[PDB]
């Protein structure tokens, strides 16, 4: 389970590079008489690929050379003033970001790109790895250039069988991800003994390292056990440590499989979505 420090470096750096590759910004609040040249001059410390003003909306769409310059430009000009107009500067919102979860953890970065690239060109594509081991947490992000590429990718991949796994896909708001929020606080426990209903013993078996903030068993509209459990921990680190030693833990008649859920939604919201994922 421990990869060599060279492989870990290569993996963590590729994900970091991919995540930070957000070159497009949106400037709002510009004067109604602003020009493209004026925005070019305001951003004279940066090399701009694109600069397009939306004169009637006081908006400018800017593409910088890389993610670093885009972040620098935001910190420098957000809440600054141009000819007394206060500006708002942020990364341009995208409606084309998916989280693909419940991937086999041995599925590589190259294989993940090969899984999501057929649907259209990508702005960002990365698996999220454990910083300690360099092992895949079984989920990744695919940000497409076009919303329609993302719509087709989700329709195909949601419920797709991939080895001993069924894939889960959800739309993610890019604006709310940070290097820390890439790491999920929710776990999915499945491969439970068939007909497992007493919640208390499972939650205590997953309390070996840290105590969960949420630990519920899944069941649908009918009231019949769907065969899985969704757990939440206070921190991302707590979730990682807990799943590392609880994976393959013998409980009843079967070795429990514990996996990371797509990050972001709380324990309750992930439980309902995963049940709705299995709805016929």
Task: Return d(Cα 280, Cα 269) in angstroms, integer.
Answer: 19
Task: Return d(Cα 256, Cα 103) in angstroms, integer.
Answer: 17
* CATH code for the domain of 48: 3.30.70.330
Query: Which residue range(s) make up the domain with 10?
Result: 1-22+94-183
- Give the closest residue to 36 by CA, choosing from 60, 10, 14: 60
Verify that 98 and 209 share a domain, yes or no: no
Query: Cβ(103)–Cβ(140) under 8 Å?
Result: yes
Verify that 14 and 140 share a domain, yes or no: yes
Verify that 8 and 122 share a domain, yes or no: yes
Burial (0-12, 13-18, 19+ Cβ within 10 Å), 44: exposed
Which one of 47, 68, 93 terminates a domain?
93
- Residue 213, CA distances (Å) to 185, 196, 237 in order: 10, 21, 14
Query: Cβ(48)–Cβ(63) under 8 Å?
Result: yes
Which one of 162, 183, 204 terminates a domain?
183
Verify that 57 and 15 share a domain, yes or no: no
Task: Return d(Cα 34, Cα 31) in angstroms, integer.
Answer: 5
Which one of 93, 125, 143 terminates a domain?
93
Count of CB atoms situated within 10 Å of the CB of 239: 26
Residue found under tokens 């990744």: 140
- Give the closest residue to 116 by CA, choosing from 140, 135, 137: 140
Q: Left (φ > 0), alpha (ψ -120 to 50) or beta: where does 138 sit?
A: left
SS (H, E, C) 213-274: CEEEEEECCCCCEEEEEEEECCCHHHHHHHHHHHCCCEECCEECEEEECCCCCCHHHHHHHH
Count of CB atoms situated within 10 Å of the CB of 278: 14
Resolution of this deposited model, Å = 2.0
Task: Return d(Cα 150, Cα 166) in angstroms, integer.
Answer: 19
Verify that 150 and 174 share a domain, yes or no: yes
Query: Cβ(120)–Cβ(157) under 8 Å?
Result: no
Verify that 88 and 38 share a domain, yes or no: yes
Verify that 7 and 124 share a domain, yes or no: yes
Verify that 5 and 127 share a domain, yes or no: yes
Verify that 150 and 130 share a domain, yes or no: yes
**E strand or H helix at 140:** strand 136-144
Verify that 51 and 104 share a domain, yes or no: no
Verify that 15 and 122 share a domain, yes or no: yes
Contacts of 85 (CB under 8 A, 6+ apart): 29, 30, 31, 58
Verify that 7 and 133 share a domain, yes or no: yes
- From first CA to last CA, the distance across the chain in angstroms is 37
Total tally of structural domains belonging to the chain: 3
């Amino acid at each position: 389970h421990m990869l060599d420090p060279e492989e870990i470096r290569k993996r963590l750096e590729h994900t970091e590079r991919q995540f930070r590759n957000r070159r497009k910004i949106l400037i709002r609040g510009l004067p109604g008489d602003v020009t493209n040249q004026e925005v070019h001059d305001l951003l004279s410390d940066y090399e701009l690929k694109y600069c397009f003003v939306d004169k009637y909306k006081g908006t400018a769409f800017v593409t910088l050379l890389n993610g670093e310059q885009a972040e620098a430009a935001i910190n420098a000009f957000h809440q600054s003033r141009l000819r007394e107009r206060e500006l708002s500067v942020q990364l341009q919102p995208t409606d084309a970001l998916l989280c693909v979860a419940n991937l086999p953890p041995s599925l590589t970065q190259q294989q993940f790109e090969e899984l999501v690239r057929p649907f259209g060109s990508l702005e960002r594509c990365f698996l999220v790895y454990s910083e300690r081991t360099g092992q895949s947490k079984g989920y990744g992000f695919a940000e497409y250039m076009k919303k329609d590429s993302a719509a087709r990718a989700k329709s195909d991949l949601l419920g797709k069988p991939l080895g001993p796994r069924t894939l889960y896909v959800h739309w993610t708001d890019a604006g709310q991800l940070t290097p820390a929020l890439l790491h999920s606080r929710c776990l999915c426990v499945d491969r439970l003994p068939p007909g497992f209903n007493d919640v208390d013993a499972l939650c205590r078996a997953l309390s070996a390292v840290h105590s969960p903030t949420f630990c519920q068993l899944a069941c649908g509209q009918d009231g019949q056990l769907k065969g899985f459990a969704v757990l939440e921990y206070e921190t991302a680190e707590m979730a990682e440590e807990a799943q590392q030693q609880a994976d393959g833990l013998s409980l009843g008649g079967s070795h429990l499989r514990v996996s990371f859920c797509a990050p972001g939604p709380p324990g309750r919201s992930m439980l309902a979505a995963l049940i709705a994922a299995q709805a016929t």
